[PDB]
A = this chain, B = another copy of it.
């Protein structure tokens, strides 16, 4: 398994699922991916994106070592959901 853009993944720990934002070829070459965490409770807060099936926290992007921490695919997000997450990060650091 190599994560792809728009997957929902769980990572191992010593967890909350995450939405993968970087492309397959970056992910495979480096063993890392950029992603944002998800929580269960909606809260009006401006950087939340509602997922159908979660709320993604777009402002908390992170680089994560997916390969060295054994990631598992939980599902995928809708394409309009992914595109909303990218647009909120872009406003913040674009």
Q: Which residues of A contact B (CB under 8 A)?
A: 21-23, 26, 30, 32, 34, 59-63, 86, 89-90, 92-94
Contact = CB atoms under 8 A, between A and B. Distances in A.
Nearest to A93: B21
Query: How many chain copies?
Result: 2
A32 B63 CA distance: 16
Contact of A89 (B32, B59, B93): B93
A34 B63 CA distance: 11
A63 B63 contact: no
Contacts of A34: 59, 61, 92-93
Contact of A93 (B32, B59, B86): B86
A3 to B, nearest CB: 13
